[PDB]
Design brief:
Chain A: One of its GO terms (cellular component) is plasma membrane. Chain A: It is found in: Nucleus. Chain A: It catalyses: L-seryl-[protein] + ATP = O-phospho-L-seryl-[protein] + ADP + H(+); L-threonyl-[protein] + ATP = O-phospho-L-threonyl-[protein] + ADP + H(+). The complex is a heterodimer. By secondary structure, chain A is an alpha+beta fold. Chain A has two domains: 75 residues, Phosphorylase Kinase, domain 1 (2-Layer Sandwich), CATH 3.30.200.20; 186 residues, Transferase(Phosphotransferase), domain 1, CATH 1.10.510. Helix content of chain A is 36%, strand content 13%. Chain A contains eleven helices and eight strands. In chain A, strands 1-2-3-5-4 form a five-stranded antiparallel sheet, with helices on one face. Chain A has a three-stranded antiparallel sheet with strand order 6-7-8. In chain A, a hairpin with a 4-residue loop joins β2 and β3. In chain A, α3 runs antiparallel to α5. Chain B is an alpha+beta fold. Chain B has a single domain, classed as 4-Layer Sandwich (Phosphatase 2c, domain 1). Chain B contains six helices and 16 strands. In chain B, a hairpin with a 2-residue loop joins β9 and β10. In chain B, α1 packs across α2 and α5 packs across α6. The longest helix of chain B has 21 residues. The relative contact order of chain B is 0.18. Classes of the chains: A alpha+beta, B alpha+beta. Chains A and B meet through α6 of A and loops of B. Bound molecules: magnesium ion (MG) (2 copies). One magnesium ion binds next to α4 of chain B.
Chain lengths: 290, 315
């Protein structure tokens, strides 16, 4: 059983109740029990349950209550990465590298599990105290999510939008995700989103994105290999943009790369970190009753 | 019979900052504000004009200047257009007339905001009101004895409760809405899917006031609806998305009706002398309640709600 602690805000503009077990913190999302418990909600849970990468926010369990169906998720006790960088400064090239390796390991895994682009929402990066680990891909993140969402009238972090998302009508989603990773790397190193600055002037930000007009300021001193990786990622033409496997073989990435993050197959990740499907199915059944 | 006696405006309002860093919502309620030539409501029982009570919600984005400007100006702009359309006192149903007057009003304000139409300042200067990326929604309702007129632009909406079935009087201008999507794309603009359907990946609406930078894809042309009042009418609710994001039409109306009746049953209707000279406490009750309900349902946006009682008397 768990004990109420707070009501924090979720990842993609959502709501959750922070609770506590073990001395472990958990994030619990809820969903109106009145037969909102379709087939969309079942597949989406079982899907997310199959995602076992340590840098993915992972499904813990599902509890039935008189009010709703409770979705217990793993909690990111470090919070949002950007809000971190703000009240702590830009990270060093070595701290940035640590986390970037984790991201790529995670993105790579998600891509392999068929999860990407708007299903993965890389604008949302979280941190957790329990390596440090950066954590992506929370429950209410898919395009077809049954989880309630309340996005703003204006888009939050447009820098994450790859130019081909604005420019073309057909493009690879996994490759658009590379650009996003670039954005996450830049913010870690500089302490500010790249193509943006007066902020919230979308005209200027979009202008800079489309012309890939960024500038690493002088107060930030980073190696030439790092600047190269960034220049290889921030290219408007998807076809000339560096790929994930290519990133995995780049010098900057390879330096101080731990052994476990040298994982090819997706099935050794699953065994690496190791509630039953019958339990989940039994509870979603009892959940259709208001 | 309805065209020979003005109605008493019964209303209550909430407009709060909620969990946001700024308040960019604004509203305006101007009862007894304008006199409506009867031919604009009736046709072709004398009373040459009906008193029209103005209600407005303006949900701003990118800043507060444009929502605030609507608050201070729009009703006056609307008044001017009503006067202009007494050059029709010479020369075309009611719908077309209202649609026409409301389009010119919303367009005038838009122009004043971008500094292409002359406006008053503390002699009639051309000065922009705000940056090119700041804008606002606008939903307004004219209530008189005979008719309700709603003119909507953006994702705030107005909902009428008629008997037992909720019926909205505006449809949200979201970029993935069929005609809207089409209009944009066919015009040469782009709607992307990113944290919802967005014009060019940025703005979660297809219509608004301001937002120069997304012209002429994001337009200030409103969608006016002309609704004759009925004896079954219970109430009218205008609100920003702060409310509609967490609650459906039907439940909002029902809750609002309950609380109105709840206050009347546990306090009885006040004397005619007080009525319409300020906020009706039963409406204020409903407004206040819906407001806190939204906050508990998890709404993190600015919240603005105007509840308007449409019932002659409740016994
Ligand atoms: Mg607002
Ligand atoms: Mg709002």
């Amino acid at each position: 059983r768990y004990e109420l602690v707070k009501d924090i805000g979720s990842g993609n503009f959502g709501v959750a109740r922070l609770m506590r077990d073990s001395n472990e913190l958990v994030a619990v999302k809820y969903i109106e029990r009145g037969e909102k418990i379709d087939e969309n909600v079942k597949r989406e849970i079982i899907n997310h349950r199959s995602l076992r990468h340590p840098n993915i926010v992972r499904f813990k369990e599902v509890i039935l209550t008189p009010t709703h169906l409770a979705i217990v998720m793993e909690y990111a006790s470090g919070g949002e990465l950007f809000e971190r960088i703000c009240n702590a400064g830009r990270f060093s090239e070595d701290e940035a590298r640590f986390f970037f390796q984790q991201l790529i390991s995670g993105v790579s895994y998600c891509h392999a599990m068929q999860v990407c682009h708007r299903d993965l929402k890389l604008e949302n990066t979280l941190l957790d105290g329990s390596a440090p680990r950066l954590k992506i891909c929370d429950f209410g993140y898919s395009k077809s999510s049954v989880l309630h969402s309340q996005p703003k009238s204006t888009v939050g972090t447009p820098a994450y939008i790859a130019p081909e998302v604005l420019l073309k009508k057909e493009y690879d989603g996994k490759v658009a995700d590379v650009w996003s990773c670039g954005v996450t790397l830049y913010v870690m190193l500089v302490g500010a989103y790249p193509f943006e600055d007066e902020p919230k002037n979308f005209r200027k930000t979009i202008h800079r994105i489309l012309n890939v007009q960024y500038a690493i300021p002088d107060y930030v001193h980073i190696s030439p290999e790092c600047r190269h990786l960034i220049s290889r990622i921030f290219v408007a033409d998807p076809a000339k943009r560096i790929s994930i496997p290519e990133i995995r073989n780049h010098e900057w990435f390879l330096k101080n790369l731990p052994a476990d993050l040298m994982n090819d197959n997706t099935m050794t990740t699953q065994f690496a970190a190791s509630q039953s499907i019958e339990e989940i199915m039994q509870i979603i059944a009892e959940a259709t009753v208001p | 019979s309805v065209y020979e006696l003005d109605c008493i405006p019964l209303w209550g309002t909430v407009s709060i900052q909620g969990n946001r860093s700024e308040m960019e919502d604004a509203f305006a309620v101007s009862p007894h504000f304008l006199k409506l030539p009867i031919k604009m409501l009736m046709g072709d029982p004398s009373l040459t004009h009906l008193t029209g009570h103005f209600f407005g919600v303006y949900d701003g984005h990118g800043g507060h200047k444009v929502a605030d400007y609507c608050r201070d100006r729009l009703h006056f702009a609307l008044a001017e257009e009503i006067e202009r359309i007494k050059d029709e006192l010479c020369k075309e149903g009611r719908q077309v007339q209202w649609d026409k007057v409301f389009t010119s009003c919303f367009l005038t304000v838009d122009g004043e905001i971008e500094g292409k139409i002359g406006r008053a300042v503390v002699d009639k200067v051309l000065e922009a009101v705000a940056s090119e990326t700041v804008g606002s929604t606008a939903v307004v309702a004219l209530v008189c004895s005979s008719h309700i007129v709603v003119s909507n632009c953006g994702d705030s909406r107005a909902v009428l409760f008629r008997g037992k079935e909720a019926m909205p009087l505006s449809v949200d201008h979201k970029p993935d809405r069929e005609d809207e999507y089409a209009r944009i794309e066919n015009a040469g603009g782009k709607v992307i899917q990113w944290q919802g359907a967005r014009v060019f990946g940025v703005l979660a609406m297809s219509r608004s006031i301001g937002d120069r930078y997304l012209k002429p894809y994001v337009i200030p042309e409103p969608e006016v609806t002309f609704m004759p009042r009925s004896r079954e009418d219970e109430c009218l609710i205008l609100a920003s998305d702060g409310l509609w994001d967490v609650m459906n039409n039907q439940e909002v109306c029902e809750i609002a009706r309950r609380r109105i009746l709840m206050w009347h049953k546990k306090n009885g209707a006040p004397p005619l002398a007080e009525r319409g000279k300020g906020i009706d406490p039963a409406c204020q009750a409903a407004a206040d309640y819906l407001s806190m309900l939204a906050l508990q349902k998890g709404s993190k946006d600015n919240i603005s709600i105007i509840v308007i009682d449409l019932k002659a008397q409740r016994k």
